[PDB]
Design a protein around this ligand. Sequence first.
Ligand code: NAD
Ligand code: NAD
Ligand code: FPI
Ligand code: FPI
Ligand code: ZN
Ligand code: ZN
Ligand code: ZN
Ligand code: ZN
Lengths: 374, 374
Amino acid sequence: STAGKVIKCKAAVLWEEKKPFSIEEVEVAPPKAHEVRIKMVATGICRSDDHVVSGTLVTPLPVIAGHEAAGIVESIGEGVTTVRPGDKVIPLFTPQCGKCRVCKHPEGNFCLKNDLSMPRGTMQDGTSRFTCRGKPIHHFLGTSTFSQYTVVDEISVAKIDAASPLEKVCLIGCGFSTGYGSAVKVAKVTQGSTCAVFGLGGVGLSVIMGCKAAGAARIIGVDINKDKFAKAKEVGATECVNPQDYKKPIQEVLTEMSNGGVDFSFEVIGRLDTMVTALSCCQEAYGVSVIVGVPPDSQNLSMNPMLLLSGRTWKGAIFGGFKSKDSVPKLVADFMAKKFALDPLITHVLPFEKINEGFDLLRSGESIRTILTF
Amino acid sequence: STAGKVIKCKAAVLWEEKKPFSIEEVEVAPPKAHEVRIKMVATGICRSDDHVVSGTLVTPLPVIAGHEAAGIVESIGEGVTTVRPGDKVIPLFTPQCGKCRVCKHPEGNFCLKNDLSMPRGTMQDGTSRFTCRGKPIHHFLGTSTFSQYTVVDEISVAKIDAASPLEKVCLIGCGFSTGYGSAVKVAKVTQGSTCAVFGLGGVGLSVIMGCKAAGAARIIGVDINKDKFAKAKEVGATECVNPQDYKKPIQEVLTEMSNGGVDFSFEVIGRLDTMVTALSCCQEAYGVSVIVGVPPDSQNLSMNPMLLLSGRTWKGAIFGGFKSKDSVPKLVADFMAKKFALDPLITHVLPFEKINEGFDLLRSGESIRTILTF
Ligand SMILES: NC(=O)c1ccc[n+]([C@@H]2O[C@H](COP(=O)([O-])OP(=O)(O)OC[C@H]3O[C@@H](n4cnc5c(N)ncnc54)[C@H](O)[C@@H]3O)[C@@H](O)[C@H]2O)c1
Ligand SMILES: NC(=O)c1ccc[n+]([C@@H]2O[C@H](COP(=O)([O-])OP(=O)(O)OC[C@H]3O[C@@H](n4cnc5c(N)ncnc54)[C@H](O)[C@@H]3O)[C@@H](O)[C@H]2O)c1
Ligand SMILES: O=CN1CCCCC1
Ligand SMILES: O=CN1CCCCC1
Ligand SMILES: [Zn+2]
Ligand SMILES: [Zn+2]
Ligand SMILES: [Zn+2]
Ligand SMILES: [Zn+2]
C-alpha cells in the first residue's frame, strides 16, 4: 500500500542543540537494497537521547534521535532475508554485521559498522532517507525512532516474537539490556558478592536487576536523588546511599561499609568524577569496575594508575556487551518466559506528540522511563 | 653460632635520594617472634630499587633497599613453623598472611599486610632490626636484600627447593614472576592472539616469555632502545618497534600493523603516557591492557573514558597476580623441571660490593638483570 513509495509522517526533529524537539512533517523514502522500513509502535526516552540535545553525545544535526524502540516492518528492500512485512522488530543502535573481526570474536559486540566512533548521521550507504522542509535530516545510530516511520539497515534490525507487548519490550532496545548485561555479562557479578551502583535511573535499576539475578548478597545503590531509593530497593537494592548526606567522600563511605571495598562497582550516570569514584570504591586487589555512563564529549578524566596496579579491573561496554542481533530476540523470549521484569522501569506513558514533556519529566528527576506511543 | 645475637655485617644503605648507595657496616638484630634472619646469597637489581633512588617510589629514608633475592635461613624466631635454619628461601615483597579478605579471595594477591600502600619501612611490629652509626635504618617492603643479612616477617618468606641455583632463582623473587604472571595469569593471553609489550627490560622480557608460553602468535616488543630488540626476539618477540623511528604516534603504528588493535597490550616501563598509549593500541571492543610499570609517585594520568566504554579492559597487578607464598615454591619447582628459563634475563654478575656499578649498567641501558653475589 505504502510499499515502494515515500511516506509523509510526523517525526520529532532536533534542529539545534539545547532546543526542544520540533514535531513536524517529514518524508521517509522507501527502503533500498537490504534496508527495512518500520512503523514505530513504542519508543523510550533514554538519557542518551537527551545527551544528543545537551551536546554531551555528539552526532550531526539536524537529527531524528531516539534509539530505544519497537515497531512493525512496513516493507523491506531487496535482498533482505531476516525480516518480513508484518514482523515485530527492535531497531539496533549497535549493529551486528556478523562479518567483521569484532562480530566474529566471541567477546566483542561493538560492531565495526557502528555509527558511534566517527558519527556520519546517515544509513550504511552514506545517505539519509529523511527529508524535512526540503532539507536532508540526519539519522541517529542507524535507528532514529522518534518518528512514526524510520528506515534502518538490515544489520541494524532484529525480528522478535510476534506476541510481545511492544510498549514494554522496547526497553530491550537499550535501557534494560544495557544495565542487565553490564552486570551479568561484562562484570559477571558472582553469587554472594557486594555490588555498588552509581546512578539509579533506568539503566542503573537494570544494573541492580542483573546483580540480583547474578546472586549478589548486597547491592548498594548510590544517588544524589533520594526519591530514587524506593524503586531501587524494589528491584534488588539492599541499601541506598546519598553522597550529599555525608561529610566524607563517598568512596570512603562505601569502602568502610563494604569492609574494604566492593567486589563490583558500576558507574551509570555519565560523570568523570563518579567514574573515578566508582573504580576506587571497588576492592584494590580484586575489585572490578564497569563504566556504563556516557561522559561529556571529548573530555578526559584524571586518575592515579596505582588504583590499577594493585589489581583492580576497569572496563566499559556499549549495550551491556550483547551482540545485538543475536541477543535481542533471546532477550524478548526470556521476557516472554517471565525471566525478568520491565514494568518497574516504566513510570510514565505518553503519546508520541508529547515527547518534549517526556524529556521534561526526565530532566526534572521525576521519571525513570517514559514510553512514547505512536 | 650467631643465633640469638646481633650480627655486624655490610649492607648498602641509601641515606638520601639521588645518591649512590653507601656500602656500610650495619647491625642486624636477631629475629623476634615469627621473624626470620636470612643470609643473603644472590639479589638482582630491579628497576624499582632505582625508583627508590630516584624518588619515583616513595618509602622512608634512610633505607636498605633490594627486594628480588634468594638466601639461606641463619636462624628463626619463636613460633616460626614454615622455614628452618639451613633452608634456601626467597623473601616476598608482597606478603601472604593467609588470613585477610584478599589472601582468602581466590584472585587477590595484594595481601593487606603489604608495606606498599602506606609505607612504614618497618617490620610487621612497626620496628626496625637495622642500625647504622647508632641510627635506625628502614626496611623496604619487608625485604631489604641489599645486605649480607636481613630479617623478614614469616608471612614475607617462602621455603624453596634445597637444590635450586639461588644465583638464578632470585629472579623468581620479582622480575620473572611479575612478567610471566602478568601475561599468563592477569592478562591470560590466549593461544593465537597478538600481544604488544612496551618496555624490554627484565620484566618486559618475562612478559614476552609468558605470552609465548600462553600460545601467542604475534608478540610485538616496543622500546626506544633498539639494543634491546635482539634479546626480546630471542625469548619470543616476533617483531620489534622503536617509537622514534616513526613520524606518527606508536598507537597508530600498532593499530595499523595489528589490523585494528591488539588483543593484549602491557605497559612495562613506568610512564603515564605509555600507559595510555598501551591501552589505546589494544582493540577497542575486546582488547585487554595490563599496567605492569610503576608510575612517578602521586602523579595522575589523563585519558578519555570512551577508550573503556567501547569494550576495552584496563588492569594492573603487583607481582604478576601471584599469591606470594604459594607460588614462589611452585615456580622454583617448575624452573627445576625446566618449564621456563631465567638465563636470558641475566646479562651481568657482580660481587655485592660493586652494587653502584650494577645500578650504572641499568641506568645506561646496558643491562637487563645484573645479579649481585654475596
Ligand atoms: N553504555 C551504553 O551502552 C549506555 C546505554 C544507555 C545509556 N548509557 C548512559 O548511562 C547513563 C544512565 O542512563 P539513564 O537512562 O538511566 O539516565 P538517568 O538520567 O535516568 O539516570 C542517571 C541517574 O544518575 C543520578 N545522578 C546524577 N548525578 C549524580 C551524582 N553526582 N552522583 C550520584 N548520582 C547522580 C540521577 O540522579 C539519575 O537518577 C547515561 O549517561 C546514558 O547516556 C550508556
Ligand atoms: N607491578 C609490579 O609488581 C612490578 C614488578 C617489577 C617491576 N615493576 C615496574 O616495571 C618497570 C619495568 O622494570 P624493569 O626492571 O624491567 O626496568 P628496565 O628499566 O629494565 O626496563 C624498562 C624498559 O623501558 C624502556 N623504555 C623507557 N622509556 C621508554 C619509552 N618512553 N618508550 C618505550 N620504551 C621505553 C627502556 O629502554 C627499558 O628497556 C619499572 O617501572 C618497575 O618499577 C612493576
Ligand atoms: O543509549 C545509547 N547509547 C549510544 C551508544 C553509546 C552509549 C549510549
Ligand atoms: O618490583 C617491586 N615493586 C614493589 C611493589 C610495587 C611494584 C614494584
Ligand atoms: Zn539509550
Ligand atoms: Zn560487524
Ligand atoms: Zn593477607
Ligand atoms: Zn622488582
